[PDB]
């Protein structure tokens, strides 16, 4: 319901990623602040490279 698991290969566990784009539910967020490039909004999940 409100849980998630991402699974990935035995080597591409680093550089595994996921892209979230929350999507507008109002049409009119587009208007004149589309040129911000956050009309629909943009974030990601990631695993850092470590040594």
């Amino acid at each position: 319901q409100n849980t998630l698991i991402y699974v990935v290969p035995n080597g591409s566990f680093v550089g595994s990623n996921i892209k979230l784009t929350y999507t507008t539910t109002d049409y009119a967020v587009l208007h004149y602040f589309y040129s911000t490039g956050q009309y629909k909004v943009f974030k990601t999940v990631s695993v850092p490279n470590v040594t």
Binding site: T36, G37, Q38, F42
Partner: protein, 51 residues
Amino acid sequence: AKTNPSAILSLSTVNITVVGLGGKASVYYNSTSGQTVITNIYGQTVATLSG
């Protein structure tokens, strides 16, 4: 820029620095002509490639 701090920001790719021993050259997508301006160490626009 002059209003909002930064977001996803776009560029006239008006240069790409390629300095060497002497002079410089550049291969720069100039988003105020709408084409690939390519310059060289002679100084001049040597090609200009549409769109």
